[PDB]
Design a protein around this ligand. Sequence first.
Ligand SMILES: CCCCCCCCCC(=O)N[C@@H](CCO)C(=O)O
Ligand SMILES: [Zn+2]
Ligand SMILES: [Zn+2]
Length: 250
Amino acid sequence: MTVKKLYFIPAGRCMLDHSSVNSALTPGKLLNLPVWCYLLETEEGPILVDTGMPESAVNNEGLFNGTFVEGQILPKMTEEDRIVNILKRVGYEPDDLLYIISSHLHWDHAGGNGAFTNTPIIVQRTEYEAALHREEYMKECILPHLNYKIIEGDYEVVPGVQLLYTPGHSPGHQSLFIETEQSGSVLLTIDASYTKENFEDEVPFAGFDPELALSSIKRLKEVVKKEKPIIFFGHDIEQEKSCRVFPEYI
Ligand SMILES: CCCCCCCCCC(=O)N[C@@H](CCO)C(=O)O
Ligand SMILES: [Zn+2]
Ligand SMILES: [Zn+2]
């Protein structure tokens, strides 16, 4: 009925201009933000939520030089942060995983997807379709021959693991509502809100369709009012200071 353990796994970092976490701010200060993956230990097996950054980001802060985000996004990734290495240190190989869940196919969430060539990768149809043509998607995040499990809308992965369709930040973004043995209800917003203030205070942040993103935040607030979960945001430096991280779990 519940997930046995929910692990927060640091998967490197990325510098992002602060105007991407609060659209009102003047550009020109970068923030060193966490990149997360999550590992769910379930009765049916281990499930990995997101896959970190692509190998091209390893020791390559200048990855986005020459692109429309030059100077605004700089990966902070070492060899240790490649998802296969993270998993091996934790105690898994890619073919051990039951599912991969892609919140969305942005570069720091699906950069590791190519490592999983057998495991089904659960991703929203609207996200998959966007990734095929929109400029903000890297080739590494939309590789053609992976075992995609394309879904549409809300979806129950296994008992205790619910996906909530939360488009706006990206065209097919999805968040997770998890029931854990130790903590009960947990909401992982992922990038439906980078920070607590994006969520609680509806502070605008980077997104494909900010209006739609706000509607998804409103939807999540309805879920929160009903379920009273503990809530974790996508790239929140303040919250990171108090997060239990691997080998601790919730
Ligand atoms: C030109 C190749 C792709 C350029 C990537 C554009 C960035 C799109 C927005 C994005 O992926 N933001 C990241 C946060 C900062 O790394 C995210 O959604 O987590
Ligand atoms: Zn994103
Ligand atoms: Zn993100």
